[PDB]
Amino acid sequence: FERINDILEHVKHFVINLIGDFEVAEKINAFRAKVHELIERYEVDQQI
């Protein structure tokens, strides 16, 4: 199973790299930046 183990390791590494390339924390950070920008644009402090 040396070849089987090597192929499994390669597949696992490819899956890990794909997940690292397609992350969700970057999307969450971008969304939080958008929310902060919208809050600053609406200027809640001036309204209150």
Partner 1 sequence: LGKLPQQANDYLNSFNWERQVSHAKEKLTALTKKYRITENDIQIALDD
Closer residue to partner 1 in complex, CB, 1/22: 22
Pairwise CA distance, residues 28 & 31, whole Å:
5
Residues of span 20-39 touching partner 1 by CB under 8 A: 20, 23-26, 28-29, 32, 35-36, 39
Instruction: Report in angstroms the alpha-carbon separations of 26 from 13, 39, 45.
Output: 21, 20, 28
User: Judged by CB under 8 A, does residue 11 bind partner 1?
Assistant: no
The two most distant CA atoms of the chain are separated, in Å, by: 69
Site residues (vs partner 1, CB under 8 A): 16, 19-20, 23-26, 28-29, 32, 35-36, 39, 44-45, 48
